[model samples]
Target: MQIFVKTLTGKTITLEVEPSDTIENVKAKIQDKEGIPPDQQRLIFAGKQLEDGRTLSDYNIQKESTLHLVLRLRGG
Candidate 1:
């Protein structure tokens, strides 16, 4: 399946994934495409946090859904 990803910077990218893919898989792909570190990536899809603990199927993803990525903020 394919989905559209929107970055905080207003960039849109296409992602190809399988129903068996986990959020970790998506995060790794996101790092490659968006240059954001896995540790810093927070993926949100279908109003749920795309945590690695769940699979795409567990989260119930749509075929042509849109995902929003937020970078983890670090500060003192």
Candidate 2:
């Protein structure tokens, strides 16, 4: 299945991954595309944090779904 990813900077990317692919894998893909590190990335789906190691199916994701990747905010 193909997944659509929207980044915090308003950039969108698409990837073809199996339904069994873990959320972490998606995150890594985002890192590779956006040049961001895993530690600095946080994925949100339906307003909830996407935990690592959880497959897309486990999270009830559908085919050609879109996920939002927000960069973690830090400092005061």
Candidate 3:
């Protein structure tokens, strides 16, 4: 299936995935395409933060659904 990932800055990316793919897997794709590391990426869909171990199927994500990608803030 195809999904849309949008950053807070309004940049959007189209990614190909399967229902069996985990959230961690999606993060890896984002890291590959946008250079944002998985650890720094927090994906949100359907008003819930996606867990790394959960597959897209677990969330019941459908085709063309949009996921918001908010980067983690690091500071002292």
Candidate number with greatest TM-score: 2
lDDT of 3 by residue, 25-47 (tens): 87787788778666665665556
Per-residue C-alpha lDDT of model 1 across residues 1-76, encoded as one tens digit per residue? 6666766666777777775677777777768876767665565554556556677667665653444444443332
Worst 10 residues of 2 by lDDT: 67-76
TM-score of predicted structure 1: 0.64
Model 2 lDDT tens row, 7-70: 5567667788786888777777667876777775556656777777878777675543554345
Comparison by TM-score, 1 against 2, better one? 2
Q: In lDDT terms, how accurate is model 1?
A: 0.62
Better of 2 and 3 by lDDT: 2
- Give per-model CA RMSD: 3.5, 3.1, 3.4
lDDT of each structure?
Answer: 0.62, 0.66, 0.65
Residue range with the least summed lDDT across 10 consecutive positions in model 1 = 67-76
Candidate with best lDDT: 2
Better of 1 and 3 by TM-score: 3
Off by over 4 Å in 2: 61-76
| Candidate 1, residue 57: lDDT | 68
**Backbone collisions counted per model:** 0, 0, 0
Clashes counted in candidate 3 amount to 0
